[PDB]
Design a protein around this ligand. Structure first.
Ligand SMILES: O=C(O)Cc1cn(Cc2cccc(Cl)c2)c2ccccc12
Ligand SMILES: [Ca+2]
Ligand SMILES: [Ca+2]
Lengths: 426, 420
């Protein structure tokens, strides 16, 4: 389904597969509003959301409602732009507010997207919507397609520089405007004290950047390591599970997007370490864990409610797939009672990745007068050292490097273990 | 591209997306042959795709062989072929990957004009609606619990049905539960024969992918996969993950129904992994087989794999060639006898198993386990001398270990230098 679908008389979920410049986020909502519908447009990015707002005011004199974590504008317009996260914060689908809900970038596999889309799919028909649109340029299974403005050239091993087992001739980046992607911060410019180039701000130049550079600077060529760092969960049974990082081949939305920084209307050249890519449409169980985490920490969802939402995400065709670990993660979080409220407040404030899990491990440490697994920033909420410095850490789960001695027999550790036996297969 | 590539005038590598329902490369080889060219076609197997019929090598300007055979023969013979077709080139078993990489590295020097990488399933393929197969989601309503959903007894009492489970144990358990409910349920998996009644009254076969015709297929939509973990305990672990099935799996399992008459496909999950990735453990398998079967130095295996990975439109893996080449280079003075035994016995990593065993015998120390992987060492108490010099984890460890052996330290150092 590649053109905006017509509003049915009764509820339907439709997939819209179309390019980024198709104005999925602008033209499509506008045409719906123009037909008299009230439409919600959901995006993962705060910057995106605020940016569609601004584009619609400047370009078309439409002042949308704009709802975002940090900021809220209410104009009474029939178009609302919101982040998935802010949408979850707002209770999800709240009453007959929207005829149409567009889940933009429905290929996103960050936690807000999965839980948000899950929530839309579970609640929309009941809340009175007629149409849900799952919109993306890059549905599951997508591979990057050749670009008319972008000639692509394989790096050979022949060139003065060390680049991921291959090499670049400086001839190719001297001079002009050049973007180079590396996977980590370290190598991102321990590409180095190398040699006009650095890893905010720059107006002839080479930019050596991670993915942190958000899409939409001038560039004549892009050079691409073709790998990226991703979060994964390991069931390491030491005693329970571990949240860690892995380096993996990039996927199609990665490659397309990195390549897309060049050839922006004027011809550009793309240079890669590797010709291939993972096709898009998979994500890790740790993203599920994060969804439960956020539901407990931010959205006051019992684990069982979160499950209902994620189950709807998973029962819906055409979305990224993942290991079915809903039962397991639901069980884990359901067991984590009586979290220290003040600790949770800080970890949220902190912007730790799993504020509920960080605060809870801190909570059992504090009650046991035991110290955190390490003294990484993550555990700042326990600056109460001497009374707790005593003895092993009761390890629930590994969220980072563990420096202290540990014990493994706390009832909650054993509880998580029994959950692993209960809910994980083979 | 959807149609056979013109034979170029200088050496080229081409891709061919055969149509989605297509069988093993038959039409396309016939065309090139008709134009006067000698064609080699390579598949994982030359058995009829149907599982019934003649071999593809039945008797000429068209030779049909396998990647396995091709590797065993030593690769591209002299100037024997103009055109080599690597068919089902989406296969990610060690033999297909090593074999294709070998073609890619050797074909031009061996006087071929054209290498064709053919598949009905390029990377990123998804399963498509089959016009003869109705697909119905399983709900949570039903007598028989099934991977978080339920199978109603009504859709399988009477008729013939196939149910895919991810593991032998699940197959045993499900069959038992069907039998107690009055259903004629038979379980199938590796190690069994044809207890599956091919007489042809009512039956519900519960099997893995080790597997007559069926009125319906019920799919758990998950599969068991071999993976490496760089676990640092002390080194790496070859283990199994249970993942969402991919498009070839979904297509192939669903395929068992609607083969003539209309069919029913029932599923636990609407989605699938996209096809086109394999694990670094396959790279490890490739070096293992290079050392164990094909008389390849690790560096010769590297050249073959590098050619594979430098080639677009093929499945992708982490680039761990330097790493794996590194660890096998360090694995010196393997005991010849043990390697024979692990090879005869069909272990997955004959070289690695026999090397860990070689290190035991020298240290005179026992195996990590006594699973039947470690057979070669039932010299079981000239030494029971405690601690096992653990190089890597190939399974579960039941003996106490020592992370002290120099080979252990060498691999660890390969890991820190070659990975990231
Ligand atoms: O900043 C925004 O606009 C989006 C947003 C993110 N969160 C928190 C969060 C973090 C990580 C995962 C999830 Cl599901 C939610 C929120 C929590 C409340 C309101 C909004 C948000
Ligand atoms: Ca592990
Ligand atoms: Ca790991």
């Amino acid at each position: 389904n590649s053109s905006p679908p017509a509003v049915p008389q009764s509820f339907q979920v439709a997939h819209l597969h179309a390019p980024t410049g198709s104005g999925k986020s602008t033209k499509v909502p506008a045409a719906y509003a123009a037909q008299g519908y009230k439409v919600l447009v959901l995006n993962p990015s705060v910057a995106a959301t605020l940016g569609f707002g601004a584009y619609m005011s400047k370009a078309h004199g439409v002042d949308p409602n704009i709802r975002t974590g940090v900021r809220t504008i209410t104009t009474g317009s029939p178009i609302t732009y919101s982040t998935y996260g802010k949408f979850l914060a707002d209770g999800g689908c709240s009453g007959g507010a929207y005829d149409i809900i567009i889940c933009d970038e429905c290929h996103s596999t960050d936690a807000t997207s999965i839980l948000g889309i899950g929530t839309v799919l579970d609640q929309a028909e009941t809340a009175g919507a007629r149409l849900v649109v799952l919109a993306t340029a890059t549905p599951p299974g997508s591979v990057t397609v050749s670009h008319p403005n972008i000639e692509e050239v394989a790096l050979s091993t022949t060139g003065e520089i060390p680049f991921y087992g291959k090499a670049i001739p400086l001839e190719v980046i001297k001079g002009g405007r050049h973007l180079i992607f590396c996977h980590s911060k370290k190598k991102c410019d321990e590409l180095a004290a190398k040699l006009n180039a650095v890893a905010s701000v720059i107006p002839d130049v080479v930019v050596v950047s991670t993915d942190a550079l958000m899409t939409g600077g001038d560039f004549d060529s892009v050079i691409d390591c073709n790998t990226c760092v991703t979060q994964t969960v390991d069931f390491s049974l030491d005693p329970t599970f571990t949240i860690e990082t892995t380096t993996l081949p990039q996927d199609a939305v990665s490659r397309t997007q990195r390549r897309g920084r060049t050839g922006r209307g004027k011809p550009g050249i793309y240079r890669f370490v590797a010709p291939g890519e993972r096709p898009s449409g998979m994500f890790d169980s740790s993203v599920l864990c994060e969804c439960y985490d956020a539901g407990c920490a931010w959205y006051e969802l019992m684990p069982a409610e979160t499950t209902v939402r994620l189950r709807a995400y998973m029962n819906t065709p055409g979305l990224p797939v993942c290991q079915d670990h809903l039962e397991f993660w639901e069980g884990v979080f359901t067991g984590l009672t009586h979290i220290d409220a003040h600790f949770l407040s800080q970890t949220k404030q902190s912007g730790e990745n799993f504020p509920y899990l960080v605060a809870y491990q801190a909570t059992v440490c504090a009650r046991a007068q035991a110290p955190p697994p390490s003294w990484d920033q993550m555990w700042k909420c326990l600056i109460r050292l001497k009374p707790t410095l005593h003895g092993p850490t009761p390890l629930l789960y590994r969220l980072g490097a563990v420096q202290n001695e540990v014990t493994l027999t706390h009832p909650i550790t054993k509880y998580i273990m029994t959950c692993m036996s209960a809910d994980l297969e083979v």
